[PDB]
């Protein structure tokens, strides 16, 4: 009944998802937006919402009375979900309709309102009918169809029937009738060819039941209509198979040159709409009634007609000349129009205005930037559009249409908000006027030659920088002349050996001065000395390697919480790390949010006051989810939440500068959504985890009594003996602590395998973490903190095969069995020479130990009789071809079975 | 789980005590069908 | 003018190869060392158990002890 992350906004919708008209008087209209379905009232200026699906919403149809709305989603696990318009918080559902079926790719509901009928996405498609007025949760009747008909993606119900449906693909059309007393659904899908008319007919789009005659209509891209008649069992057939009603292609006629694709029929008119901005109404004779045409309007994909049957004024009225021999009054319902290019309009029934509504991004979507002091947010498409909203007002305001065919993706404000900037996929960069979106530079800057991938301003307005997908950096600077500021190019440099993952500006308050910082996938981090940089010479002076076995993804300033200062970075290991504002060395190991995928990007909520200085919050997105974190991080699951959005992928972040709201832009969903947050709900969730070790104990299997936990605790004592030495004549003594050299031993002893580099990292972490407060190195570590280190450093589950497989797959040939495999001497030599080096005698000792040729423990009694045996054992123990299967049989008696999650918050 | 080398130590620790009464062992083997067929083989070799 | 020089890693694939090798080396060293520790813990287990009888590790000392 309350949530941390609630949704209520939609910007944009996919124009291929057909609109309907519901409540007329107030103007409230229905559109689908990714996995969500939405109602919006123009005059109240408020949205109403239908709450999600397991996948993107695939298809919908509204009852004729606009009381009922039905919807489906694509992908697995699909649900068919039906709704009452005027409760506005309704429910109805069909569970589990199809196991494999990838959601229902077309679906109609009876105007009769008794039945629902559906077409599944599947390699062979399903047809099923559903008595939705009953709480039925299984198909009443079923058929599956040859592939030859193709994707079937239009379906309609017959207003003159209860047991007839039509469907077509691009390339086949189908008639259906359901014999419920027989329990049989029958189909026919006859094949058209040129022979029927010796004429071109080509591809066709939609099919519909005629107004009054035993007929089925099909509309063509060819400018033509096709019509069929149905034939029903002749009486002599009734004694036999009574071959279910057959469809015959009586007639073809050409109605216009231009492509038609829309067809719907209203109150004994037919209505047809075109690729190029002409919409026509007809009487069942196919007689011509006055059309609507040539507005700034095209490829009309959404037609819909009002619930209101028109009352009839005639004393003063505006009606058009019908084209009858006389030409009479003509009064449609009100009706809705919308284009291909996502342009939404309502018509006054009397024609006196063609009124347009919201207008929205055509195609694919990329993430939005907020003004830092004003309730303004800027949205941009790939195509031709950047536009700004006041997200409190929900009002569409200033926008500029951009030059044709340039792709655009990156957007930024400068820290003042006075400037806006955008990045264009064809080698192109603009600076923009945070008012008029004038091209500030008389020409844009077009120095690079492929897609941007980041842009950012310095704290100084005078400097801006971008990344490009060629892994090349570029920087931008202001020059002061004549009392003017002008913007000017600054010089490119290639500094990353893999895809760039973040780009950042930095301040030297130490000198009130600007800094430039870049995150690559190459595990390398760099800073550039702007103040020494010069033309054709970005001054590169600092490279760090910052990840291992993995790669980083995001870079931001950590907020000030400390004397020290940090950058925050995240990696494919689900790890987060802090690096030092001077040395960029590491000391923090964190476990990222468990939620399904690694973090893609994070942004930090703004500060008003000391009250925020007392309480800081971090926002992040992953592949498919958006989530919140309270600082400091410690990997506690209760400390974090994440929620699912546009679940074919999310691609950027933006935050309301008041600190109330966040906005997510998807991609192919063409949709942007606002999110409204309760922090106290997360404080409550934190309280669910309790305090002290309780969360971390909960992370250990069996917590404080699990046999694992006791097994670990012994190693603390055993390693304490090792630190004392096994041989001593004194009293034994132990207390609270192990000495850091033992810590790698204990960590391995539990079952996690840090590299030498990881060891160095952890020793740095322990030494330095206390350092700045104490002034001191410290080297006695206590169990509770060691446990925290393990829990952060460990693989985010049990140890996994996957990296082993990947390593063999890189190193090995595919063998006779194709298995990725390594030859024994090559394998040995590589293990000595490469990676981290091994001494030959060291490696031989290791193998002899693993095979168990030595005496055990290697820590009290001598051995040297053994080692000569291992020389021959290197041949005799190791097979000539080695594989992950063999190597894991040698290393592992542990069957490292797979983890599970579903209960975890 | 991770306990291989212990097998070797135990393997040597395994005791060595012999067949407690060898005549019994011999007599049992003489009733073995395979041995009886071996004696038949010895008849065939003649 | 020409793009600038690179600053070079000779190949990312060398990073792939070396990290794979490090992965194997890690698993070998870890297994060897863990076997050492678990074995030693067996012999000492009697000693270890009596030590725990005497006094306990800080967390389980603080509650349990």
Automatic annotation (TrEMBL), chain B:
<comment type="similarity">
    <text>Belongs to the dynein heavy chain family.</text>
</comment>
<protein>
    <submittedName>
        <fullName>Dynein, axonemal, heavy chain 6</fullName>
    </submittedName>
</protein>
């Amino acid at each position: 009944k309350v949530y941390p992350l609630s949704m209520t906004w939609s910007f944009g919708w996919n124009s291929s998802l057909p609109v309907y008209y519901m409540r007329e008087d107030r103007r409230v209209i229905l559109y689908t937006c990714a996995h969500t379905a939405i109602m919006y009232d123009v005059v109240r200026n408020t949205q109403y919402h239908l709450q999600g699906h397991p996948n993107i919403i695939s298809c919908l149809c509204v009852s004729e009375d606009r009381r009922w709305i039905a919807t489906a989603d694509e992908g697995p696990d699909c649900l068919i979900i039906i709704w009452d318009s005027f409760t506005g918080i309704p429910v109805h559902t069909i569970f589990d309709s199809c196991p494999e079926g990838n959601g229902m790719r077309s679906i109609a509901i009876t105007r009769d309102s008794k039945f629902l009928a559906t077409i599944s996405d599947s390699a062979t498609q399903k047809v099923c009918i559903w008595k939705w007025t009953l709480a039925v949760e299984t198909p009443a009747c079923t058929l599956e169809l040859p592939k030859e008909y193709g994707f079937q993606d239009n379906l309609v119900f017959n207003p003159a029937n209860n047991k007839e449906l039509v469907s077509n693909s691009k390339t086949q059309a189908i008639y259906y009738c359901w014999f419920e007393d027989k329990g049989i659904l029958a189909h026919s899908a006859p094949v058209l060819t040129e022979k029927t008319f010796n004429k071109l007919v080509g591809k066709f789009s939609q099919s519909v039941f005629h107004l009054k005659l035993p007929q089925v209509l099909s509309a063509t891209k060819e400018g033509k209509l096709v019509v069929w008649d149905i034939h029903y069992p002749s009486s002599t057939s009734s004694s036999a198979i009574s071959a279910f009603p057959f469809i015959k292609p009586r007639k073809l006629v050409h109605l216009q040159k231009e492509a038609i694709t829309v067809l719907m029929t209203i109150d004994s008119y037919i209505v047809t709409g075109d690729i190029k901005g002409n919409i026509k109404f007809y009487d069942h004779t196919l007689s011509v009634v006055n059309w609507y045409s040539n507005f700034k309007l095209g490829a009309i994909r959404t037609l819909s007609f009002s619930k209101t049957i028109p009352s009839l004024p005639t004393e003063k009225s505006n009606l058009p000349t019908d084209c009858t021999l006389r030409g009479d009054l003509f009064v449609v319902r009100n009706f809705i129009i919308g284009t291909f290019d996502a342009t939404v309009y309502h018509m006054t029934v009397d024609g006196t205005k063609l009124e347009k509504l919201f207008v929205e991004p055509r195609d694919a979507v990329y993430a939005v930037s907020c003004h830092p002091y004003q309730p303004l947010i800027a949205v941009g498409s790939v195509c031709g559009m950047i536009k700004v909203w006041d997200f409190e007002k929900k009002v569409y305001l200033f926008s500029r249409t951009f030059e044709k065919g340039l792709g655009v993706q990156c957007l930024t404000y400068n820290p003042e908000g006075a400037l806006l900037g955008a990045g264009f996929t064809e080698g192109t960069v603009y600076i923009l006027d945070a008012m008029s979106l004038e091209n500030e530079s008389p020409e844009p800057f077009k120095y690079s030659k492929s897609s941007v991938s980041h842009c950012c301003f310095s704290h100084d307005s005078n400097y801006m920088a971008t990344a490009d997908v060629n892994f090349t950096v570029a920087v931008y600077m202001v020059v002061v002349k004549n009392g003017q500021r002008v913007w000017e190019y600054l010089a490119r440099l290639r500094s990353h050996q893999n895809s760039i993952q973040s780009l950042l500006f930095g301040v030297h308050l130490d000198s009130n001065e600007p800094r430039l910082l870049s995150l690559g996938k190459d595990r390398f981090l760099i800073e550039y000395n702007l103040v020494k940089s010069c033309k054709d010479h970005l001054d590169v002076l600092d490279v760090h390697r910052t990840d291992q076995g993995n790669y980083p993804t995001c870079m931001i300033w950590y907020p000030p919480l400390t004397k020290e200062l940090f950058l925050l970075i995240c990696n494919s290991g689900y790890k987060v790390k802090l690096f030092n504002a001077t040395t960029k060395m590491c000391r923090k190991t964190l476990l990222g949010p468990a939620y399904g995928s690694p973090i893609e990007h994070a942004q930090v909520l703004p500060v008003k006051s000391t009250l925020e200085l007392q309480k800081r919050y971090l926002v992040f997105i992953n592949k498919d989810k958006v989530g919140l974190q309270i600082l400091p991080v410690d990997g506690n699951p209760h400390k974090t939440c994440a929620i699912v959005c546009h679940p074919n992928g999310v691609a950027g972040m933006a935050l309301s500068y008041d600190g109330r709201f966040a906005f997510t832009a998807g991609g192919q969903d063409r949709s942007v959504v606002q999110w409204k947050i309760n922090l106290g709900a997360l404080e409550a969730a934190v309280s669910l985890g309790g305090e002290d070790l309780t969360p971390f104990y909960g992370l250990v299997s069996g917590g404080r009594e699990g046999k694992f936990y006791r097994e670990l605790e012994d190693y603390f004592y055993y390693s304490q003996i090792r630190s004392q030495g096994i041989d001593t004549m004194e009293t034994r003594q132990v207390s609270e602590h192990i000495c850091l050299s033992e810590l790698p031993f204990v960590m391995r002893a539990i079952g996690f395998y840090p590299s030498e580099e990881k060891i160095e990292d952890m020793f740095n972490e322990i030494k330095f973490s206390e350092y700045v407060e104490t002034g001191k190195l410290i080297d006695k570590i206590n169990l509770p903190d060691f446990l925290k280190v393990y829990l952060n450093h460990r693989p985010p589950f049990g140890n996994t095969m996957d990296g082993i497989q990947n390593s063999f797959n890189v190193l090995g040939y595919t063998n006779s069995e194709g298995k990725k495999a390594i030859r024994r001497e090559d394998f040995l030599n590589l293990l000595l020479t490469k990676g981290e080096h091994m001494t030959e005698e060291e490696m031989i000792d290791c193998f002899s130990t693993l095979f168990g040729l030595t005496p055990e423990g290697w820590k009290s009694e001598p051995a040297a009789t053994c080692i000569n045996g291992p020389e021959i054992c290197l041949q005799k123990e190791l097979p000539e071809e080695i594989t992950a299967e063999i190597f894991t049989t040698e290393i592992l008696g542990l069957t490292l079975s797979d983890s599970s999650e579903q209960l975890i918050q | 789980h991770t306990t291989k080398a212990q097998e070797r130590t135990r393997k040597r620790q395994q005791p060595v005590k012999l067949e407690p009464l060898p005549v019994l062992k011999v007599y049992q083997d003489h009733k073995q069908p395979e041995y009886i067929y071996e004696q038949n083989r010895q008849k065939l070799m003649s | 003018r020409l793009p600038t020089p690179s600053l070079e890693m000779t190949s990312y694939e060398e990073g792939e190869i070396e990290m794979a090798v490090i992965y194997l080396q890690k698993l070998l060293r870890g297994r060897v060392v863990q076997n050492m520790m678990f074995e030693g813990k067996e012999k000492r287990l009697e000693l270890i158990l009596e030590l725990r009888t005497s006094h306990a590790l800080q967390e389980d000392d603080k509650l349990v002890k």
